[PDB]
Design a protein around this ligand. Structure first.
Ligand code: NA
Ligand code: NA
Ligand code: NA
Lengths: 93, 92
């Protein structure tokens, strides 16, 4: 049976495809699509238990480059960055 | 439970499960990463690995086992392993 981390990675893949399937190459999504994804699929990037500033700016940079295509590995980079900016494990220092 | 938030939460706990065991709780060595992959991805990864890219990736962790990686690096590695092993990318 599937391990907890296998299941988590599976969900990273299906969430990616939920968006990547919508235009063009199914193995890509645009930075604009990724911004949509982060809005819709994750909790709020506002408040004192997250790096609100870092998250604001990360999201704004996705705007600046909305047409640029992102692969799965890059998507995971962005997810990892947001996770570090939002998860108490990291923000508690 | 199927949300992205919960999946990322598991990425973080699985990271710390291993990073907590020695030194900085925000790093794990490449040798421990290899261990984590064998233990925590038993079906997608070895024990033993049939794919070329995965074989190389695992050998490199061994060669470089004392180098330390942070969560972002661990996440990237996991992503690369996923692209190398998941039917979505592989059956394309
Ligand atoms: Na696409
Ligand atoms: Na959100
Ligand atoms: Na450590």
């Amino acid at each position: 049976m599937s391990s907890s981390l296998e299941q988590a990675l599976a969900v990273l893949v299906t969430t990616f495809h939920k968006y990547s399937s919508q235009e063009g190459d199914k193995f890509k999504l645009s930075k604009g699509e990724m911004k949509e994804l982060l809005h819709k699929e994750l909790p709020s990037f506002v408040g004192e238990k997250v790096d609100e500033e870092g998250l604001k700016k990360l999201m704004g940079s996705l705007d600046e480059n909305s047409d640029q295509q992102v692969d799965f590995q890059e998507y995971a980079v962005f997810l990892a960055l947001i996770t570090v900016m939002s998860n108490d494990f990291f923000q508690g220092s």
